[PDB]
């Protein structure tokens, strides 16, 4: 079982990051969403891969 490297990469442009500055936790909220979406990626790669 080659523990191959899966490349997960996410970026948040400065325009979209300063456009939505009205929220005090925008980075935090998108971080949690990405964490959970990576869990779903683990499931979905395990089956659909």
């Amino acid at each position: 079982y080659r523990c191959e490297q899966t490349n997960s990469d996410t970026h948040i442009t400065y325009q979209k990051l300063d456009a939505w500055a009205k929220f005090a936790d925008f980075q935090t909220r998108i971080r949690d969403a990405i964490i959970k979406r990576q869990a779903l990626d683990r499931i979905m790669i395990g089956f659909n891969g």
Binding site: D18, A19, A21, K22
Partner: protein, 48 residues
């Protein structure tokens, strides 16, 4: 640039709302035989 104002608005885009009025206000009315007619005066103009 020292005279120019600076402000730390924490929003990328906004508007500036000024109230103003719609014109003359004071006007006597014949309250004995006429109602006191009331008219709104707030011309909220919005910049960007």
């Amino acid at each position: 640039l020292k005279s120019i104002n600076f402000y730390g608005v924490p929003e990328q885009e906004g508007e500036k709302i000024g109230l103003g009025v719609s014109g003359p206000v004071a006007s006597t009315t014949d309250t004995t035989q006429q109602d006191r007619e009331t008219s709104d005066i707030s011309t909220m103009d919005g910049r960007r």
